Design a protein around this ligand. Structure first.
Ligand code: 0MI
Ligand code: 0MI
Ligand code: 0MI
Ligand code: 0MI
Ligand code: 0MI
Lengths: 348, 348, 348, 348, 348
């Protein structure tokens, strides 16, 4: 028997929804869920979604608390709905998907993914839950993660990191690297070879290779020589140009990371959602240099170097498609006299 | 196991809360409670109270659906709280009392009136409920209604009319005239002799006496003659004076009713609540005569006659005090040369 | 180029969305849509739906303004979504269907019903629109209305009445009686024989048969005589029993209508939606008789007679099933010694 | 004469309510109080309570700005209401108590604590305000703080820290250590001997003894030897076990403090209120180790050592009651072969 | 053609309003603007103003993204409205001015500043926009900024810093020091000689002279001797007195900056708006010293020293008017025996 007061009971006594018997008095006022604790109302939940307050509350309580793929990954694979769990988008404070299966009676389009309503949707399945590998086999459309081989299914090895309760991390006490599988129209699909973005914070940025350590420690000229990068415009692309009114380049998160420890800047996240390429309106506090749409990607610098050096430098301008986080990312490559002028995630 | 979804199940299937088991999907958006019926949301309750929406929804669902005293009667006797029921105030679209006893978890102060937190409050007991007559006996402060005699207690006979689901009616298939008994600090009270307002509507006003019939039928001068009312200013007080900018008199509901059938007027009910005396901002549409605060009471005309004929007409102005619906109503009485000038419920 | 301001221009100038070009200043405050007219704000739409205010505003602006089936008829036939129109549900002040097709960008699931996302949904096609008869032929699941014959398809004749801008009427200057055709999984259905509710109002109730006239005019005993209805409990079932605390019978709208003209009563419409059977919490103001869930259907009296006279009166109680408005309505039939005791739409 | 505009006046010109003459134009929109400053609206207050916006505003303005006991302390002593002041709960952004005495006409259950309505409630009295010691003597239920001896009243010495405007601190320019007194039913109650939690932040944690300094500086093995703690499971209890998927132990705030300066973690405060024991859903960023209900207490480590070493280690499992912040805190003590396995605040 | 969906389009694809063709689906719910990105609603904007949500959204999108004067400066010059741009107040999350000219059809009092409605208002003009110097010449009231000389107009050199997207900065890639001009009633006004506040953060405070570097590094006694400040009460005025319950002095932001790096304090910004003098309710965490209205100004310490030493020290108390940010700031100067007791921005 689901109820608001039982959802609330579970949150108060178990920290999330955990299937327990019980009820607690709840008051709902506008978009906030409160519970009575010793005479006074204590806030349990502020609805930040476009769902009704008591609905968002139930889905948030019912959020998956195992490590799970980052929303950008699910999105890039075309996931529409999850089987019998909620993937909570901690970057949006909302569910990652509009509807549920077997979670919540207001949002459920089905109780079980085998119901035919679910066949046109890409259902996300979790091989760590009993029975879910088999439901993927029977689903017309789906994405499946597992911790091991599935007999006959050709795997795609996922990123090292996963999200655990909004914290992105490479697991040591828990597994966060999954096999990925995808089906379109009953047909298992070959996933493409791909790079993976590293999901690091500007605040907490830590290098993950010698080349990255070198980039952070060395001066610009010295790194560019040491890694034989002359003619590839890392001065514009990665390090950034703060000399003009429009801020030049600065498209690699490590490059922002470098600049941040000298002087701060403002980054307006004006479409705040998880995604492989992010767009910020950036203002440099030291110089006043700025740029309205500054696209930024967190590639391991090794990977970025590998990507740009693979390029034919003989055309003035061309679209360069690179597979990253399973999606195809377009870059613009501008060349002159066989050297790179600029190379950036193409603004769409 | 109280829940939002179970209360909603009871509403949907039984029309009101009925102790049934079951659940239905509920969504709450601002102040409105919806349920899903075949995939579309159906509005089930709009909160018009100062309570949280889900709390108000439950108390409304749990309203007393038997004929109960009108709220004005309960306020006049000083009722603070009800025993194991909710008296719903249909004039305020809200509960009649702040707290509850054995009704709802967010608003309960106790689960039985015997608890000590209740001793100071005047608790309303309904003799029609097994065991409440005996709870009243052991209650320190309380008001009690019954349908027949209570052994060892002299009764006060109530109004003929009661409220059944917001309809004020004199019961023919059910009993609406109660016995009333009251206790302060352990001591049964003698309730004062009292008149009762008649609780009638302007639109569907019916006379309840030959004098009231004669008043609706006869012309002004005739009536005042037949009942020897020369010098009592019923022209001003009951018939109303619409010849000057400030509307004159018109303090008796029957006199509004008479006027309303010939020509309409606005009654602005600026403190919308149940009360023995109502104040209206009246605009007469035919003449433009108006009055900001026109106090109005629905007394049986004969009772109003009896009251006005029992006053000393020999002082210019004074306060005249009348027990009505068990409360003391002050009237201003204005006289000149031993005839009435005006006489109106005091605007205090 | 769809916009909030253009939809508002269309409302202001054409009364509804009409494809015109133009813009007007719009402000949105909570759930209300305003436009500026000579420097003051004029309210243009109050959202009473679970949709976002601007989304609801647009779907309402885009409502079908031709006579369309009543929502109860469409629900009974299982319509999920409409083709390139919005059926507006005037009893719920909301759209009849969750999603749209070719109507509004925030709610569209497709732009034409031929798209594959639509195949599973029962799509409502309006033969009066060029090309929709042929879209229905190629539709997997669908309901279709037409004004005249469709070649190669046997029709089901609908109710005489349709909804034009929330007014349910039998059309004299326009046609309201449609042909109905239905398809599940590619296969044209034979629609069942059915009665149709009459969709009439308590206030403005008109008879549509000599029996209905005789019922409104004659006294109870006379009528029951003229039509040989001894032993069918029309006293209880149609005329209503107001002598006990629980109101007795009163399940036929014509019987409410008769009572309403002599004395009034409260009908609490606690699930306000369009449905073939309505449940009301009724309080009779003259007697105080009442019933929490009084199920009410507006059947042509003669049709109700025909139904009750076609039952086996020889079992104490059983479920009686009747096709009405294309859906199966369960009735409880209660009998003793071969006469009817009661017979009411099942409270299920 | 109280008014919204005068409350607002005081806040603008005095920083809080200070009894001053004056008014300023105020606008209220939804839950925010604004004032006009030179043409534009400036936000004064966002209602975060379950009270009406203008009510919460007045109570917040009227908040006590002297050092006052922490809400957890008042709660543990059963305080229901304060005499002639508002204790503002800065952890809840709301008043610590539902009602007032002599503060606010919407929330006042009385003007003065001697009114009999107040007798069943534990009224908090402030010996630093004239007359309040005497009101405690006359109150049927109460908690009193003073800065010195009260003749005849046996004191309880309180914690060193108090809250001054939401900042918890041990006063140097002001006194923050009070005597505590409590009355139940007219009878002064012996307060129990008790420990006091230290109220430190994870962010700003500072040790307060050699043992705490040693814990922060030394390695685990070294401290455990230096303070002769073998067999007491500080490895699990205080230091924490991040090696498994469920995070083990970690129940002392200093232990979290230690871990925080190496690698960060997430602590969801999912019942956000002041209390002696706090429950967090914790995710370790380095390892992915997590635990849904991780109870944490800030005891001076000396005190924790004193507590655990006092225990009989010869039973597999037993509840161990310790008085802390005047309340009785239950611990679970799990032992094996005369050494501690675990010891944690019992989850209720 | 303006529209909500086109404003939203520009924000999504350009980071702000940029005049581009296009539309995106938008949902508005209460005070938040959302757009659909791949099935889910992404928040674009939370209305923090007292304007309607979709209005504030448009004005915020249309905010000036060039360096512009700080709101405190515009306010001190009496600016009421801007010509054909929005100055966004990032400290209030709202437009700096109530109305617009040529920006937004809901807020526009005119299309062009020459319309006579604009003549009584001080219109802000931006010499960097074509045609705006000339509109200032024709305006009856106005404030104009330029980057260079305007023929015949006697300039006032502004502060070195400007606001670029909420970041206050002295421009290196962009110009942030403007000429200022003002007209009252058709008459260009002499702007006064003035000091300028430095607009630094407590968090990010950086000295800007040897004297400031000395103040931060030296001990109190040493600086006061080195800069020959005996008798001027910097001990009270600048350094602050935390020894009593009322916190003494502490009126220079650099003085707060000094204290902050030793021990933290709380500063309640209780009128949160940009202004030359700021008022904080300050609580010192170390000592519990506090003060309800502590006025603070960020003058370059050199300037403050220059100001106080200019004073006649022979009167017990006098108002001392100093021009700062073009406005006249009142100080109270309290002297005794020819030495300063206190000197603070006069509380009004
Ligand atoms: C307590 C609470 C939580 N959330 C949701 C969205 C946030 O990303 C996430 C919390 N992240 N962590 N740790 O949960 C919310 O929306 N409102 C609330 O009142
Ligand atoms: C359906 C609904 C009902 N009520 C309450 C208050 C009214 O006095 C009463 C309705 N009166 N009658 N018969 O019920 C409400 O407040 N909101 C709602 O949405
Ligand atoms: C003007 C306005 C209209 N409606 C909708 C729902 C109602 O059924 C219908 C009006 N009925 N008729 N004729 O239109 C709404 O919901 N809010 C509004 O502010
Ligand atoms: C200015 C403002 C303050 N408060 C309340 C709750 C916070 O704990 C406290 C502020 N704490 N400090 N310093 O006051 C609020 O709720 N809304 C508001 O707009
Ligand atoms: C994204 C967003 C922004 N603002 C406004 C007010 C803030 O000062 C400014 C953002 N400052 N920076 N970088 O823009 C807002 O009010 N709501 C919103 O949802």
């Amino acid at each position: 028997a689901m109820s608001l007061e039982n959802v609330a009971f579970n949150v108060v006594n178990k920290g999330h929804f955990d299937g327990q018997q019980g009820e607690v008095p709840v008051s709902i006022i506008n978009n906030t869920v409160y519970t009575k604790v010793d005479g006074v109302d204590v806030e349990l939940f502020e609805n930040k979604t476009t769902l009704p307050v008591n609905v968002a509350f139930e889905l948030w309580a019912k959020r998956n608390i195992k490590p799970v793929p980052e929303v950008k990954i699910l999105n890039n694979l075309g996931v529409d709905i999850a089987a019998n769990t909620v993937i909570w988008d901690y970057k949006r404070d909302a569910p990652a998907h509009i509807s549920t299966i077997g979670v919540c009676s207001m949002t459920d389009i089905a109780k079980k993914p085998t119901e035919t309503i679910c066949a046109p949707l890409t259902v996300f399945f979790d091989g760590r839950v009993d029975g879910q590998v088999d439901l993927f086999r029977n689903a017309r459309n789906g994405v499946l993660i597992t911790e091991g081989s599935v007999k006959g299914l050709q795997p795609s090895v996922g990123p090292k990191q996963a999200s655990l309760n909004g914290v992105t991390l490479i697991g040591e006490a828990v597994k966060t690297q999954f096999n990925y599988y995808k089906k379109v129209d009953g047909v298992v699909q070959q996933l493409p070879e791909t790079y993976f973005t590293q999901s690091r914070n500007l605040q907490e940025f830590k290098p993950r290779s010698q080349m990255e350590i070198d980039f952070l420690e060395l001066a610009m000229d010295e790194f560019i020589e040491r890694y034989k990068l002359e003619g590839y415009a890392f001065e514009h692309i990665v390090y950034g140009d703060f000399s003009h009114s429009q801020l030049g380049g600065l498209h690699l998160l490590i490059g922002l990371a470098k600049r941040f420890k000298e002087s701060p800047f403002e980054l307006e996240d004006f479409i705040p959602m998880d995604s492989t390429v992010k767009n910020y309106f950036i203002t440099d506090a030291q110089t006043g240099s700025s740029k309205c749409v500054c696209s930024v990607i967190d590639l391991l610098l090794d990977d970025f170097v590998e990507i740009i050096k693979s390029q034919d430098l003989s055309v003035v301008s061309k679209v360069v498609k690179v597979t990253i986080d399973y999606t195809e990312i377009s870059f613009m490559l501008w060349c002159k006299d066989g050297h790179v002028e600029t190379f950036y995630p193409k603004l769409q």
